[PDB]
From Swiss-Prot:
Means of activity regulation: Inhibited by Remdesivir antiviral drug (GS-5734).
Protein name as it appears in the record: Guanine-N7 methyltransferase nsp14
Compartments where found: Host cytoplasm; Host endoplasmic reticulum
Residue span(s) of domain N7-MTase: 239-459
Biological source species: Severe acute respiratory syndrome coronavirus 2 (2019-nCoV)
Part of the full-length chain shown: 5949 to 6449 of 7096
Binding-site residues for Zn(2+) 15, renumbered to this chain: 200, 204, 207, 222
Binding site for Zn(2+) 16: 393, 412, 419, 422
Length: 459
């Protein structure tokens, strides 16, 4: 039970306005045949065009919402909309394109999908709210067959070319005209009452309905993301490495250790309240401070209300010492905080668009993150870059240009000249810091934080 059986029933009620007379009793096998595709009894890695909700979740990076609206059915122009915001008009002869024949539309579909997906996934999963026209339009741009590899590399083939009779992955498909072995899922099979807009609007106010196909495609994928990553959360699902995951996560751990260590040295807090992940370890194990942990899993719907996290009767006094909120997203941080908050607006291959302004951050695991909000940081200030170190000035064991920096807080810099070891460590730390910032993480601190207080920690 890993793939979706072609003999599973498909509820057809949502299809009967575009396809009147459609049988109520329908399997995926009969639906695929009706869509103009022939599976030929093939045991070659592609058992069904449609996939399970569990397979869709493992391949969330491949999700592309897709909707087709009858502009005027073999005789009428169709408006093809995608969750990329693209609308194409295909004539049978928010970007809006004029009507063109299928032979040129299919070229655009392949280019659009390849550019969107080459750095995200080895496939495409068309996410539908199936009414009929989208299913019957697939024969005009989709070819199916056995699982194949790219002509130019070892990746699985996602595109086909009728000009050269060859196959390509998303990276090598320039000039290709057919989508090859795509996957799809109909959200209407999950059990909903009412239309797409009424279900989407229950959870999201950011996607409006401009009455175009791409608006529906966007809403469909958003509703699917809400169902699979907001109301349902699965942290047992692992996702492959597609970018800087390892470096970003290592940088996050380095910056956390640096910032907390310096805050403890500068303001000598007697107690630290570490609010967040229940599997957390002390980021500064050698610190004197009374370290107290409070469990809160990453919120995936709305940011935690600080009143619920702290009140209703613990140290009780969160006002004592400092609070560390390392990726624990709250509505309004208290003034005595050290905060790392992911900015959902950041563009990257790890950060996918989400529900209600939120984003789906996929780095080893999938984390739906509530929308970034600047008002959460009103009691704090942005944490400035700095490098602090009390380690001995000693090289041990990469050429050198002397480092001059006001933010290298070391004994050598206090003494007037940065040593080679602390210059190498400063540059490595600055690289880790810039990686984490560009990855989308933002850092905030209590207003009284001042790196000038670190210089006297060397006596
Ligand atoms: C915004 C995602 N959250 C809540 C994290 O804690 C996280 C997840 C994966 C990687 C990293 N570095 C951080
Ligand atoms: Zn390739
Ligand atoms: Zn939405
Ligand atoms: Zn030094």
């Amino acid at each position: 039970p890993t793939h979706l059986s072609v003999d599973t029933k498909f509820k057809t009620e949502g299809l009967c306005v575009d396809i009147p007379g459609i049988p109520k009793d329908m399997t995926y096998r009969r639906l695929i045949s009706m869509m103009g595709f022939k599976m030929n009894y093939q045991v070659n890695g592609y058992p069904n065009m449609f996939i399970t909700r569990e397979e869709a979740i493992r391949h969330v990076r491949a999700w592309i919402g897709f909707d087709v609206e009858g502009c005027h059915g073999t005789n009428l122009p169709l408006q093809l909309g995608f969750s990329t915001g693209v609308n194409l008009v295909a004539v049978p002869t928010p970007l809006m394109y004029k009507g063109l024949p299928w032979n040129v539309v299919r070229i655009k579909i392949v280019q659009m999908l390849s550019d969107t997906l080459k750095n995200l996934s080895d496939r495409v999963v068309f996410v539908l709210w199936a009414h009929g026209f989208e299913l019957t339009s697939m024969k005009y741009f989709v070819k199916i067959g056995p699982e194949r590899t790219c002509c130019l590399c070892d990746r699985r083939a996602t595109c086909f070319s009728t000009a050269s009779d060859t196959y390509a992955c998303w990276h090598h498909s320039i000039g290709f005209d057919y989508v090859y072995n795509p996957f799809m899922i109909d959200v209407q099979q999950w059990g909903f009452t009412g239309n797409l807009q009424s279900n989407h609007d229950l959870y999201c106010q950011v996607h409006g309905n401009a009455h175009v196909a791409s608006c529906d495609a966007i809403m469909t994928r958003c509703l699917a993301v809400h169902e699979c990553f907001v109301k349902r959360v699965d942290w047992t699902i692992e996702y492959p490495i597609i970018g800087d995951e390892l470096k970003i996560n290592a940088a996050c751990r380095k910056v956390q250790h640096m910032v907390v260590k310096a805050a403890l040295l500068a303001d000598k807090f007697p107690v630290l309240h570490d609010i967040g992940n229940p599997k957390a370890i002390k980021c500064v194990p050698q610190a004197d401070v009374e370290w107290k942990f409070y469990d809160a899993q990453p919120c995936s719907d709305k940011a935690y209300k600080i009143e619920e996290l702290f009140y209703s009767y613990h140290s009780d006094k969160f006002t004592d010492g400092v609070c560390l909120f390392w990726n624990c997203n709250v509505d309004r941080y208290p003034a005595n905080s050290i905060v790392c908050r992911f900015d959902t607006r950041v563009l990257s291959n790890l950060n996918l668009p989400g529900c209600d302004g939120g984003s789906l951050y996929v780095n080893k695991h999938a984390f739906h993150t509530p929308a970034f909000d600047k008002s959460a940081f009103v009691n704090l200030k942005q944490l400035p870059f700095f490098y602090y170190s009390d380690s001995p000035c000693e090289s041990h064991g990469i050429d050198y240009v002397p480092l001059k920096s006001a933010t290298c807080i070391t004994r050598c810099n206090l003494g007037g000249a940065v040593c080679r070891h602390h210059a190498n460590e400063y540059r490595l730390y600055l690289d880790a810091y810039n990686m984490m910032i560009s990855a989308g993480f933002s850092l905030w601190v209590y207003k009284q934080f001042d790196t000038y207080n670190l210089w006297n920690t060397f006596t």
